[PDB]
Design a protein around this ligand. Structure first.
Ligand SMILES: Nc1nc2c(ncn2[C@H]2C[C@H](O)[C@@H](COP(=O)(O)CP(=O)(O)OP(=O)(O)O)O2)c(=O)[nH]1
Ligand SMILES: [Mg+2]
Ligand code: NA
Ligand code: NA
Ligand code: NA
Length: 316
DNA sequence: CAGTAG
DNA sequence: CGGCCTTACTG
DNA sequence: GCCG
C-alpha cells in the first residue's frame, strides 16, 4: 500500500494539470514519479533519499521536500483556472486535450455549452450522452456478467471460440472502468468471419447500444445489461488468430504502463513487442526482424530475460 | 495527416 | 540532446 | 517531469 499519500495526492493534481493542458511528457514524468512513490516500501523522509529512487530527480525531490516540510505545494496555488474545465471537457470519451483546449478558446465552460453550441464528432456525442456512466467503475461482478454475455453470444456461432476478459478484470481488480474481451480459436482459423456476426447478434439482443470504433479485429462500443438499475458500460472486444494469442493476451491484460515498460525493455534488447508478437533482430523502425515463438505469456517474459509476473502483479 | 484511444 | 510503446481507427 |  502507498506510504506517501501525503505526497502523491499533491503531485497527482499537478500531474493531471499538465496532462489536460497538453504537456504530456511532463505529465508522464510526474505519473512515473507517483507510481514510484506509491509502490515504495517506507514513507520517504529525506531529499537525498528521494533522489536515489528511480523516476525521481532533483526537481521532483525538491517538490517532495516542500510537501514534507510545509505540508503544501506552492505550485498547486498557481494552476490555471482553465484546468477544471479542460478536465471536464476531456472526460468526454473521444475528446482529448486538443479538443478541450479548442472548446475552451471558443468560450465554452460547461457541458451545457458543449451540448448546445460545440461541434461534436459522432464518438464525442456518444461520450457526452453517457458522461456520468463512463466516469464510473463497475463492480467486478458486473464485468463478469458482461464477459459471459459476449462469450455466450460468441460460442453460439462456434462453441470452440475462446473468450477471455482481460484488462483490469484479469488483473483481479475489485472494480473495472470497462470490460475488455479477447476472442480467439485454438484451431487457428475459426476466429475469422465472426466479428461482424457477433456484433449483429449482440446488437439485435439489445445489449450493444452504441459503437465507437469498429475495425478489422478491434471493436470499442457501449453496452448495457438487461433489467432495471443498469448503467451503460464501455466494452472493448478484440479478435485475434491463435498464433498471436500469447502476445494479444499479454497486451490486453496490461496494465498500460506495464505494457509500455515491457515494450521499452524489448527495444533496448534489439527486439520489438506488440499485441501481434515479440520480434528479434529488429533494425531500428527499418527492419522487420524475426518473429520469436511465444506459445504462452511466460515465453515472452523468458525471451526478455524477465521473471514471470502474474496478471495481478502488472500494475506497472 | 492529427487527434484519440486501447 | 532528445526519447519517453506500439498499433489502430476516424475523418 | 526523468533518464541514458
Ligand atoms: N501498449 C499499450 N497498451 C495499452 C494502452 N492503453 C491500454 N492498453 C492495454 C493495457 C490495458 O490493460 C488494456 C485495456 O485498456 P483499458 O481498458 O483502457 C484500461 P484497464 O487496464 O482495463 O483498466 P480499466 O481502467 O479499464 O479498469 O489495453 C497504451 O497506451 N499502450
Ligand atoms: Mg479495461
Ligand atoms: Na476524452
Ligand atoms: Na478497455
Ligand atoms: Na493510450
Amino acid at each position: 500500500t502507498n506510504h506517501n499519500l501525503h505526497i502523491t495526492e499533491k503531485l497527482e493534481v499537478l500531474a493531471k494539470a499538465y496532462s489536460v493542458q497538453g504537456d504530456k511528457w511532463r505529465a508522464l514524468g510526474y505519473a512515473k514519479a507517483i507510481n514510484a512513490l506509491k509502490s515504495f516500501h517506507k514513507p520517504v523522509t529525506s531529499y537525498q533519499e528521494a533522489c536515489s529512487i528511480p523516476g525521481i530527480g532533483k526537481r521532483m525531490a525538491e517538490k517532495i521536500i516542500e510537501i514534507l516540510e510545509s505540508g503544501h505545494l506552492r505550485k498547486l496555488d498557481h494552476i490555471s483556472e482553465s484546468v477544471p474545465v479542460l478536465e471536464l471537457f476531456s472526460n468526454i470519451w473521444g475528446a482529448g486535450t486538443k479538443t478541450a483546449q479548442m472548446w475552451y478558446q471558443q468560450g465554452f465552460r460547461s457541458l451545457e455549452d458543449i451540448r448546445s453550441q460545440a461541434s461534436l464528432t459522432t464518438q464525442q456525442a456518444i461520450g457526452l450522452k453517457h458522461y456520468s456512466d463512463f466516469l464510473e467503475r463497475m463492480p467486478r461482478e458486473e464485468a463478469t456478467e458482461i464477459e459471459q454475455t459476449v462469450q455466450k453470444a460468441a460460442q453460439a456461432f462456434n462453441s470452440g471460440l475462446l473468450c477471455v476478459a482481460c484488462g483490469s478484470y484479469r488483473r483481479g481488480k475489485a472494480t473495472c472502468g470497462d470490460v475488455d474481451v479477447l476472442i480467439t480459436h485454438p484451431d487457428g482459423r475459426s476466429h475469422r468471419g465472426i466479428f461482424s456476426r457477433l456484433l449483429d447478434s449482440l446488437r439485435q439482443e439489445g445489449f450493444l447500444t452504441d459503437d465507437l470504433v469498429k475495425g478489422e479485429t478491434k471493436y470499442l462500443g457501449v453496452c448495457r445489461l438487461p433489467g432495471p438499475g443498469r448503467r451503460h458500460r464501455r466494452l472493448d472486444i478484440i479478435v485475434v488468430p491463435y498464433s498471436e494469442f500469447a502476445c494479444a493476451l499479454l497486451y490486453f491484460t496490461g496494465s498500460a504502463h506495464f505494457n509500455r515498460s515491457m515494450r521499452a525493455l524489448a527495444k533496448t534488447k534489439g527486439m520489438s513487442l506488440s499485441e501481434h508478437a515479440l520480434s528479434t533482430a529488429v533494425v531500428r523502425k527499418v527492419g522487420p526482424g524475426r518473429v520469436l515463438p511465444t506459445p504462452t505469456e511466460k515465453d515472452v517474459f523468458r525471451l526478455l530475460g524477465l521473471p514471470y509476473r502474474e496478471p495481478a502483479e502488472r500494475d506497472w
